[PDB]
DNA sequence: TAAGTCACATGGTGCCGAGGCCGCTCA
DNA sequence: TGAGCGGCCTCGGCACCATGTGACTTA
């Protein structure tokens, strides 16, 4: 499932060219946002040791995001 | 869990010449190590020709994992029909150039090494003498595991295992009497004489030894960081024409 | 429903970082991915509803994710294939 | 049924059996002389304890199967111990629970308009007894 | 034939139809080849189902394909950028059929290798480049290392299962390079999308219409 | 209240029912279709000779079973398939495929310990389990004979409770539980599943059966089995349970007649052909062996492994497929307890047995009883050369 | 290495003190009686 | 936050029951 | 400092339901 | 040529023993 699915995934909770470039960004930008959380993710699960990540883990890194955003 | 893949060698080849050249060609040092061991101590194993020539050829970079720990352990004796076999552990890509080396440069012809039946039962039998420091031999009894793959029609018996505890190992061993290869001599036979099955015959892909080591029909692989004495041996007598 | 993602778009979508990167993500956490994700959208589009040129540039700065349009088609290039990370570079 | 010797006690166990499993031929075999069991004499009493059970099943489903061949029952059901069993006399649907040559319990299942409920259980109370005697008073009031 | 770049240069419904047939009763030249891609690459107007038609029903060699043949064919399966916009985007579905046409038959490997970056190339790139790939100098660490890029990329489809496929190549040829099957690892482990990559269909009625084509061509060759 | 009748309608994907009537050949469909517009009716509008007729002109137009299969899910019965429904199809694929269903037994012990020989009121039975199952879940269950064997299989189906999830109102299945009932044997057959759902069953199973003195089940077998006649082969009130293997000719009596026979066709005045087996160790020691003692040697094997010369009738598939047997011999070698573990996998254990020692692989005559295939498909502990099964 | 050694020497004890455990249940279990 | 079913959690779960079964084995011993 | 006991955290073999493609396969 | 059942088979979740290493104690 290519980038451009997403792509077609926002266009479709949405609803030329110009438009499905400015779609094909902000599909980079959610990548971005989930890289990010995951990445933060999995610094908080080796600061507590753990292999895995679990709920409670990415739940609390996304409020320390989102509350600087 | 260090797989060694095992290689026959067509010649008696000389290590401690000509390796200049490959440190030149891998632009490192290999560690070199020459050892002349004496494996059937045993009386009635031997008493002549017993000698072997023993490399331990090592890349070495660093010491954390087989990813830079790739060995090499070379025997040879020049008084048999194939006169030399070598096996190496590690997954390293230059395991395959040191080989193609060895070709190109003693012009030995090399083949992989497969184990019969009574070849692995004898190695299940090697891998269990330990040479002490104080020059005596060790029997460590472990907790065996033969393990078979038949193949059937319509798949009727995929696999089937035969696990022999360690106390019943050793308690068969001491029923037969004091021998120094319990498993051809003692396991063996109690497994032939009681479920029928002749294991020499049956299709026998990997004996385990519990924590120790699990032999293959084409590799062993060793929990110890290398190889022992009589299962070099071993290896060297199952190769022969 | 319609509006939610499923968890196998989730897989497709980020199994390869996750495997680059040694991430472990049990079923309860992907099921709690695939619930954030919708979080996720809600904000963006609370933050961006209408696209033009400079105020995507401006909140993705905003966001602490980039810099400049450098790092914009930086991170374009490790997420587009090529012939869309050079379209978008035309764009930009 | 095959017994093997025991290589410890010198005493047969049931080693093999073609039995099916509602007669507890391993409970009969350690009930015969309270265990184990050594001379020839424990192992027949064993063995007629069982082939009374084989006669039992064997005389009922007899019985059962000359009643259908009377014609006095229509088409009847039997289990692998002819002990639940139902037929129709002419079109009451007369099941019973029988055990070894006595039927212990009846019902009379089907209903009919002029039928009634007291002579039904007058019914089922008189069709109790032996299996004979069912047959004879089956025979009579049939009539 | 002379039929075949007549119709050709007449290109410059009934024509196409003299075409077909004149491809599947001789099959045209390595410059007939030539000029039939330049003709159908740089135009438009020619439906785009009558594009995949003609490239995987009248595109028949007769015999070598020469050097310049595939020049050409390159020049095409590129993209405009940023430094090129005058020339127009080739249909990546016509550029997808040319390369699985281009699977039906040093500097070269990484040619295709470059051109192995493409997405919509990926599924008919990599036999080419399985092909390219008989020495164990061909190999190398630059290599490994944009491939494994690629592959672990996303917003790709078929890069995991068909890189895979290219690194196991790679390791069954080359035993040097220091070891990549932790690369391998790294990039998917179901067995399934590279089990279906390893074998690979050509489309056996255009098999038997290009043997029977080459049949009729050259004798002892 | 909350037993569930024949007539509600559960919330069941049309996907997964779609699918499900695919496997199903044609002319139980036609029987199904019948019966059920007899009983409960749909809404397609016609009378039952009518609908009766529209299927016969179905039958022979020779449609496939696709055609009529959107039919009665999309217009005689568009709202939803009823539970009654969702049971009989699906008891409808047990009885096609029986192979694609593993069993478990449990014996019916009580009080003392002697065995309860179980006796089923089968309507009755149904009413008391899903009045006694309706105190805890929403149940329904659903009972039939087997139209071969001589069994009652039951399926007792149990239904649980119920971002913005919209509005469904539904009742979601699970998967259903199946407890096979013999006509008169202890041991009861029920499917595999470790879950609470699965213990609650068992549990107002064994409570309902009762009604007497209390009954508890007492699983004899951890590996499931499939084929339910091969666990009726095996567990069920059969001659072939506890004479198996090289003793499966008592289970068959193929070899003794009646004693008001003819004593001129009798074993003992015609005589048998064997071979003199040697008892000194000679198989270990050995080419183009005489071909009439070879398919005596091939009888050999062939009487040990399945009990008769000819088998119970490729050739080495036994009475009963096994798939997992494990086995722990235990002897007393001069005061020490030694222990051997063989565990066994495969589609046919002792047919691939038997094929290996066909292969002289394995001594013919040092197998013991229980390798042969004695007491099949228990697992268990020889001691004394003994067997007892594990539990 | 001299801590590899020392880590191998360790990982034999432990081998050891793990079957020694594994002998003394299976002594027990063939002191049971089922 | 104790939604931690899984290795390093149920592996401890077995080490605990053992520890108990020892524990009660040699309660009931002697010495 | 060599050897031992300990829980601990990761490695790994076996198992199975789900589901997919394959592998002919037959009308 | 086209739908179609069955062995294969791998995903992966679970279950259990197996295993190597640090921490800690003993001599």
Same mark, same amino acid.
């Given at each position: 499932?290519?980038?451009?699915?997403?792509?077609?995934?926002?266009?479709?909770?949405?609803?030329?060219?110009?438009?499905?470039?400015?779609?094909?960004?902000?599909?980079?930008?959610?990548?971005?946002?989930?890289?990010?959380?995951?990445?933060?993710?999995?610094?908080?699960?080796?600061?507590?040791?753990?292999?895995?990540?679990?709920?409670?883990?990415?739940?609390?890194?996304?409020?320390?995001?989102?509350?600087?955003? | 869990?260090?797989?060694?893949?095992?290689?026959?060698?067509?010649?008696?080849?000389?290590?401690?010449?000509?390796?200049?050249?490959?440190?030149?060609?891998?632009?490192?040092?290999?560690?070199?190590?020459?050892?002349?061991?004496?494996?059937?101590?045993?009386?009635?194993?031997?008493?002549?020709?017993?000698?072997?020539?023993?490399?331990?050829?090592?890349?070495?970079?660093?010491?954390?994992?087989?990813?830079?720990?790739?060995?090499?352990?070379?025997?040879?004796?020049? $008084?048999?029909?194939?006169?030399?076999?070598?096996?190496?552990?590690?997954?390293?890509?230059?395991?395959?150039?040191?080989?193609?080396?060895?070709?190109?440069?003693?012009?030995?012809?090399?083949?992989?090494?497969?184990?019969?039946?009574?070849?692995?039962?004898?190695?299940?039998?090697?891998?269990?003498?330990?040479?002490?420091?104080?020059?005596?031999?060790?029997?460590?009894?472990?907790?065996?595991?033969?393990?078979?793959?038949?193949?059937?029609?319509?798949?009727?018996?995929?696999?089937?295992?035969?696990?022999?505890?360690?106390?019943?190992?050793?308690?068969?061993?001491?029923?037969?009497?004091?021998?120094?290869?319990?498993?051809?001599?003692?396991?063996?036979?109690?497994?032939?004489?009681?479920?029928?099955?002749?294991?020499?015959?049956?299709?026998?892909?990997?004996?385990?030894?519990?924590?120790?080591? $699990?032999?293959?029909?084409?590799?062993?692989?060793?929990?110890?960081?290398?190889?022992?004495?009589?299962?070099?041996?071993?290896?060297?007598?199952?190769?022969?024409? | 429903?319609?509006?939610?993602?499923?968890?196998?778009?989730?897989?497709?979508?980020?199994?390869?970082?996750?495997?680059?990167?040694?991430?472990?993500?049990?079923?309860?956490?992907?099921?709690?991915?695939?619930?954030?994700?919708?979080?996720?959208?809600?904000?963006?589009?609370?933050?961006?509803?209408?696209?033009?040129?400079?105020?995507?540039?401006?909140?993705?700065?905003?966001?602490?994710?980039?810099?400049?349009?450098?790092?914009?088609?930086?991170?374009?290039?490790?997420?587009?294939?090529?012939?869309?990370?050079?379209?978008?570079?035309?764009?930009? | 049924?095959?017994?093997?010797?025991?290589?410890?006690?010198?005493?047969?166990?049931?080693?093999?059996?073609?039995?099916?499993?509602?007669?507890?031929?391993?409970?009969?075999?350690?009930?015969?002389?309270?265990?184990?069991?050594?001379?020839?004499?424990?192992?027949?009493?064993?063995?007629?304890?069982?082939?009374?059970?084989?006669?039992?099943?064997?005389?009922?489903?007899?019985?059962?199967?000359?009643?259908?061949?009377?014609?006095?029952?229509?088409?009847?059901?039997?289990?692998?111990?002819?002990?639940?069993?139902?037929?129709?006399?002419?079109?009451?649907?007369?099941?019973?629970?029988?055990?070894?040559?006595?039927?212990?319990?009846?019902?009379?299942?089907?209903?009919?308009?002029?039928?009634?409920?007291?002579?039904?259980?007058?019914?089922?109370?008189?069709?109790?007894?032996?299996?004979?005697?069912?047959?004879?008073?089956?025979?009579?009031?049939?009539? | 034939?002379?039929?075949?770049?007549?119709?050709?240069?007449?290109?410059?419904?009934?024509?196409?139809?003299?075409?077909?047939?004149?491809?599947?009763?001789?099959?045209?030249?390595?410059?007939?080849?030539?000029?039939?891609?330049?003709?159908?690459?740089?135009?438009?107007?020619?439906?785009?189902?009558?594009?995949?038609?003609?490239?995987?029903?009248?595109?028949?060699?007769?015999?070598?394909?020469?050097?310049? +043949?595939?020049?050409?064919?390159?020049?095409?399966?590129?993209?405009?950028?940023?430094?090129?916009?005058?020339?127009?985007?080739?249909?990546?579905?016509?550029?997808?059929?040319?390369?699985?046409?281009?699977?039906?038959?040093?500097?070269?490997?990484?040619?295709?290798?470059?051109?192995?970056?493409?997405?919509?190339?990926?599924?008919?790139?990599?036999?080419?480049?399985?092909?390219?790939?008989?020495?164990?100098?061909?190999?190398?660490?630059?290599?490994?290392?944009?491939?494994?890029?690629?592959?672990?990329?996303?917003?790709?489809?078929?890069?995991?299962?068909?890189?895979? +496929?290219?690194?196991?190549?790679?390791?069954?040829?080359?035993?040097?390079?220091?070891?990549?099957?932790?690369?391998?690892?790294?990039?998917?482990?179901?067995?399934?999308? +590279?089990?279906?990559?390893?074998?690979?269909?050509?489309?056996?009625?255009?098999?038997?219409?290009?043997?029977?084509?080459?049949?009729?061509?050259?004798?002892?060759? | !209240?909350?037993?569930?009748?024949?007539?509600?309608?559960?919330?069941?994907?049309?996907?997964?029912?779609?699918?499900?009537?695919?496997?199903?050949?044609?002319?139980?469909?036609?029987?199904?279709?019948?019966?059920?517009?007899?009983?409960?009716?749909?809404?397609?509008?016609?009378?039952?000779?009518?609908?009766?007729?529209?299927?016969? %002109?179905?039958?022979?137009?020779?449609?496939?079973?696709?055609?009529?299969?959107?039919?009665? %899910?999309?217009?005689?019965?568009?709202?939803?398939?009823?539970?009654?429904?969702?049971?009989?199809?699906?008891?409808? %694929?047990?009885?096609?495929?029986?192979?694609?269903?593993?069993?478990?037994?449990?014996?019916?012990?009580?009080?003392?310990?002697?065995?309860?020989?179980?006796?089923?009121?089968?309507?009755?039975?149904?009413?008391?389990?899903?009045?006694?199952?309706?105190?805890?879940?929403?149940?329904?269950?659903?009972?039939?004979?087997?139209?071969?064997?001589?069994?009652?299989?039951?399926?007792?189906?149990?239904?649980?409770?119920?971002?913005?999830?919209?509005?469904?109102?539904?009742?979601?299945?699970?998967?259903?539980?199946?407890?096979?009932?013999?006509?008169?044997?202890?041991?009861?057959?029920?499917?595999?599943?470790?879950?609470?759902?699965?213990?609650?069953?068992?549990?107002?199973?064994?409570?309902?059966?009762?009604?007497?003195?209390?009954?508890?089940?007492?699983?004899?077998?951890?590996?499931?089995?499939?084929?339910?006649?091969?666990?009726?082969?095996?567990?069920?009130?059969?001659?072939?349970?506890?004479?198996?293997?090289?003793?499966?000719?008592?289970?068959?009596?193929?070899? !003794?007649?009646?004693?008001?026979?003819?004593?001129?066709?009798?074993?003992?005045?015609?005589?048998?052909?064997?071979?003199?087996? !040697?008892?000194?160790?000679?198989?270990?020691?050995?080419?183009? !062996?005489?071909?009439?003692?070879?398919?005596?040697?091939?009888?050999?094997?062939?009487?040990?492994?399945?009990?008769?010369?000819?088998?119970?009738?490729?050739?080495?598939?036994?009475?009963?497929?096994?798939?997992?047997?494990?086995?722990?011999?235990?002897?007393?070698?001069?005061?020490?307890?030694?222990?051997?573990?063989?565990?066994?996998?495969?589609?046919?254990?002792?047919?691939?047995?038997?094929?290996?020692?066909?292969?002289?692989?394995?001594?013919?005559?040092?197998?013991?009883?229980?390798?042969?295939?004695?007491?099949?498909?228990?697992?268990?502990?020889?001691?004394?050369?003994?067997?007892?099964?594990?539990? | 290495?001299?801590?590899?050694?020392?880590?191998?020497?360790?990982?034999?004890?432990?081998?050891?003190?793990?079957?020694?455990?594994?002998?003394?249940?299976?002594?027990?279990?063939?002191?049971?009686?089922?």
């Amino acid at each position: 499932m290519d980038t451009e699915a997403l792509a077609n995934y926002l266009l479709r909770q949405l609803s030329s060219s110009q438009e499905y470039n400015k779609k094909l960004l902000l599909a980079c930008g959610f990548q971005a946002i989930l890289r990010k959380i995951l990445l933060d993710a999995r610094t908080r699960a080796t600061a507590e040791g753990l292999r895995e990540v679990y709920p409670y883990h990415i739940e609390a890194a996304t409020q320390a995001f989102l509350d600087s955003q | 869990p260090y797989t060694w893949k095992f290689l026959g060698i067509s010649k008696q080849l000389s290590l401690e010449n000509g390796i200049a050249k490959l440190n030149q060609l891998l632009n490192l040092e290999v560690d070199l190590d020459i050892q002349t061991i004496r494996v059937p101590s045993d009386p009635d194993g031997g008493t002549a020709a017993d000698e072997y020539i023993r490399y331990e050829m090592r890349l070495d970079i660093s010491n954390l994992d087989e990813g830079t720990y790739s060995k090499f352990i070379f025997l040879g004796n020049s $008084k048999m029909e194939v006169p030399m076999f070598l096996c190496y552990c590690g997954t390293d890509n230059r395991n395959e150039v040191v080989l193609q080396w060895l070709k190109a440069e003693y012009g030995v012809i090399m083949w992989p090494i497969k184990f019969e039946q009574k070849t692995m039962i004898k190695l299940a039998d090697a891998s269990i003498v330990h040479v002490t420091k104080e020059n005596i031999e060790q029997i460590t009894w472990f907790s065996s595991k033969l393990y078979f793959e038949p193949e059937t029609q319509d798949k009727n018996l995929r696999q089937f295992s035969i696990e022999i505890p360690r106390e019943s190992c050793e308690g068969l061993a001491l029923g037969y009497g004091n021998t120094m290869h319990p498993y051809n001599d003692a396991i063996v036979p109690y497994i032939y004489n009681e479920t029928g099955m002749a294991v020499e015959r049956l299709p026998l892909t990997s004996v385990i030894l519990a924590g120790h080591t $699990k032999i293959m029909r084409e590799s062993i692989v060793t929990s110890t960081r290398s190889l022992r004495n009589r299962v070099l041996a071993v290896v060297l007598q199952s190769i022969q024409f | 429903s319609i509006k939610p993602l499923q968890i196998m778009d989730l897989k497709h979508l980020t199994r390869q970082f996750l495997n680059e990167n040694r991430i472990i993500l049990p079923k309860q956490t992907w099921s709690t991915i695939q619930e954030e994700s919708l979080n996720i959208m809600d904000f963006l589009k609370q933050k961006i509803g209408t696209l033009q040129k400079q105020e995507l540039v401006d909140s993705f700065i905003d966001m602490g994710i980039i810099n400049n349009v450098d790092d914009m088609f930086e991170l374009a290039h490790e997420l587009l294939p090529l012939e869309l990370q050079s379209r978008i570079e035309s764009y930009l | 049924v095959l017994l093997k010797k025991r290589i410890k006690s010198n005493s047969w166990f049931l080693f093999k059996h073609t039995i099916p499993s509602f007669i507890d031929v391993q409970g009969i075999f350690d009930d015969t002389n309270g265990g184990l069991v050594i001379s020839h004499d424990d192992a027949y009493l064993f063995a007629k304890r069982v082939f009374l059970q084989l006669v039992e099943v064997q005389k009922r489903r007899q019985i059962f199967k000359d009643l259908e061949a009377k014609k006095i029952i229509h088409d009847l059901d039997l289990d692998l111990e002819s002990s639940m069993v139902s037929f129709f006399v002419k079109d009451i649907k007369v099941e019973l629970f029988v055990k070894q040559n006595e039927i212990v319990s009846c019902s009379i299942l089907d209903d009919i308009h002029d039928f009634s409920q007291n002579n039904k259980s007058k019914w089922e109370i008189a069709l109790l007894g032996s299996l004979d005697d069912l047959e004879l008073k089956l025979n009579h009031s049939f009539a | 034939s002379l039929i075949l770049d007549d119709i050709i240069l007449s290109l410059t419904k009934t024509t196409l139809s003299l075409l077909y047939e004149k491809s599947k009763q001789y099959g045209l030249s390595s410059p007939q080849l030539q000029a039939l891609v330049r003709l159908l690459c740089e135009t438009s107007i020619i439906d785009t189902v009558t594009k995949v038609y003609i490239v995987e029903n009248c595109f028949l060699p007769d015999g070598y394909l020469t050097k310049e +043949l595939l020049l050409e064919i390159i020049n095409h399966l590129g993209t405009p950028t940023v430094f090129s916009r005058y020339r127009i985007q080739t249909p990546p579905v016509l550029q997808s059929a040319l390369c699985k046409w281009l699977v039906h038959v040093n500097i070269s490997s990484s040619i295709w290798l470059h051109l192995w970056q493409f997405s919509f190339l990926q599924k008919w790139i990599t036999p080419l480049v399985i092909w390219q790939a008989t020495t164990p100098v061909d190999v190398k660490p630059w290599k490994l290392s944009i491939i494994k890029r690629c592959a672990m990329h996303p917003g790709y489809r078929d890069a995991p299962g068909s890189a895979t +496929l290219i690194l196991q190549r790679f390791q069954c040829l080359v035993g040097a390079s220091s070891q990549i099957t932790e690369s391998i690892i790294t990039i998917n482990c179901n067995r399934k999308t +590279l089990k279906s990559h390893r074998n690979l269909k050509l489309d056996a009625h255009f098999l038997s219409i290009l043997k029977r084509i080459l049949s009729r061509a050259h004798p002892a060759n | !209240e909350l037993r569930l009748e024949d007539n509600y309608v559960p919330t069941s994907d049309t996907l997964v029912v779609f699918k499900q009537l695919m496997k199903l050949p044609v002319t139980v469909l036609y029987d199904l279709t019948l019966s059920w517009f007899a009983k409960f009716g749909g809404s397609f509008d016609g009378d039952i000779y009518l609908l009766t007729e529209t299927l016969d %002109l179905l039958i022979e137009k020779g449609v496939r079973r696709n055609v009529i299969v959107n039919r009665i %899910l999309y217009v005689y019965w568009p709202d939803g398939l009823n539970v009654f429904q969702l049971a009989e199809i699906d008891c409808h %694929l047990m009885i096609s495929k029986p192979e694609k269903f593993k069993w478990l037994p449990s014996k019916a012990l009580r009080g003392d310990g002697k065995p309860y020989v179980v006796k089923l009121q089968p309507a009755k039975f149904i009413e008391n389990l899903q009045t006694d199952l309706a105190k805890i879940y929403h149940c329904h269950v659903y009972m039939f004979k087997h139209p071969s064997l001589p069994v009652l299989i039951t399926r007792i189906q149990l239904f649980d409770s119920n971002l913005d999830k919209f509005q469904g109102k539904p009742l979601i299945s699970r998967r259903p539980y199946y407890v096979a009932f013999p006509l008169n044997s202890p041991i009861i057959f029920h499917s595999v599943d470790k879950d609470i759902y699965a213990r609650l069953v068992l549990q107002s199973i064994s409570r309902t059966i009762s009604e007497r003195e209390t009954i508890i089940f007492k699983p004899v077998q951890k590996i499931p089995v499939k084929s339910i006649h091969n666990i009726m082969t095996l567990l069920g009130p059969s001659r072939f349970a506890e004479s198996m293997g090289p003793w499966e000719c008592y289970a068959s009596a193929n070899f !003794e007649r009646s004693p008001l026979h003819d004593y001129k066709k009798h074993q003992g005045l015609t005589g048998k052909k064997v071979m003199v087996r !040697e008892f000194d160790d000679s198989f270990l020691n050995d080419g183009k !062996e005489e071909p009439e003692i070879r398919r005596l040697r091939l009888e050999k094997n062939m009487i040990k492994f399945k009990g008769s010369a000819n088998g119970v009738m490729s050739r080495y598939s036994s009475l009963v497929p096994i798939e997992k047997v494990g086995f722990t011999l235990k002897n007393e070698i001069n005061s020490r307890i030694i222990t051997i573990k063989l565990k066994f996998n495969g589609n046919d254990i002792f047919g691939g047995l038997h094929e290996l020692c066909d292969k002289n692989l394995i001594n013919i005559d040092k197998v013991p009883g229980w390798l042969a295939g004695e007491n099949g498909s228990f697992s268990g502990t020889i001691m004394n050369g003994d067997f007892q099964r594990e539990q | 290495e001299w801590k590899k050694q020392r880590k191998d020497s360790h990982k034999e004890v432990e081998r050891r003190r793990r079957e020694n455990i594994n002998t003394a249940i299976n002594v027990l279990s063939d002191l049971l009686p089922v």
